[PDB]
Amino acid sequence: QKPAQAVNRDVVIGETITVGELANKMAVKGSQVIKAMMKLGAMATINQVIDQETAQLVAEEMGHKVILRRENELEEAVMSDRD
RNA sequence: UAUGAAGAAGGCCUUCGGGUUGUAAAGUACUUUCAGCGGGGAGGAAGGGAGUAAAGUUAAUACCUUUGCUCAUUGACGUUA
Numbered sequence: 001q002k003p004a005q006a007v008n009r010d011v012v013i014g015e016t017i018t019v020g021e022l023a024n025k026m027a028v029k030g031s032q033v034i035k036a037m038m039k040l041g042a043m044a045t046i047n048q049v050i051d052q053e054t055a056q057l058v059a060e061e062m063g064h065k066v067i068l069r070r071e072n073e074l075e076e077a078v079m080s081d082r083d
Numbered sequence: 084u085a086u087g088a089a090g091a092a093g094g095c096c097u098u099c100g101g102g103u104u105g106u107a108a109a110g111u112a113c114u115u116u117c118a119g120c121g122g123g124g125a126g127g128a129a130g131g132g133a134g135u136a137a138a139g140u141u142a143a144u145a146c147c148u149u150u151g152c153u154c155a156u157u158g159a160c161g162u163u164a
């Protein structure tokens with residue numbers, strides 16, 4: 001019952017994230033390969049911090065399921081209910 | 084909820100041989116309490132009103148009183164329980 005499925009788990013991302021937490025938040029197989037993935041795509045470092053849109057771009061590169069959460073939703077829900 | 088050892092990745096500790104997070108997760112079967120969407124549906128209502136009957140009262144079959152029977156009705160809660 002063990003297929004060869006690659007990492008495809010759902011991952012929630014915040015507004016501003018960094019490499020150190022991103023290492024285990026996605027749990028990708030290439031522990032350093034994940035680190036090189038950013039350093040290759042654009043100028044980036046060990047401690048570099050990316051944004052939620054850039055984080056969505058990253059998750060697209062990894063291909064795992066992506067979830068975007070931002071704090072402004074509270075205003076959006078109120079706006080939606082308006083008649 | 085039951086099953087679930089590739090005792091998986093990733094983390095951490097490592098006497099780098101391993102241990103642990105751990106049946107935990109993933110996968111495979113089973114169920115829908117509550118919320119959500121529709122349908123149905125108690126109890127809180129006792130009464131009061133209109134006729135009609137008989138008893139009681141009187142000059143009086145009237146009017147009034149006591150007891151029936153019959154008819155239509157009384158809920159903010161409330162889209163109730």
Ligand SMILES: [K+]
Nearest residue numbers: 091092093103
């Ligand atoms: K391990």
Ligand SMILES: [Mg+2]
Nearest residue numbers: 117118119120
């Ligand atoms: Mg319900």
Ligand SMILES: [Mg+2]
Nearest residue numbers: 126127128129
């Ligand atoms: Mg009753």
Ligand SMILES: [Mg+2]
Nearest residue numbers: 126127128158
């Ligand atoms: Mg009732």
Ligand SMILES: [Mg+2]
Nearest residue numbers: 137138139149
């Ligand atoms: Mg009498």
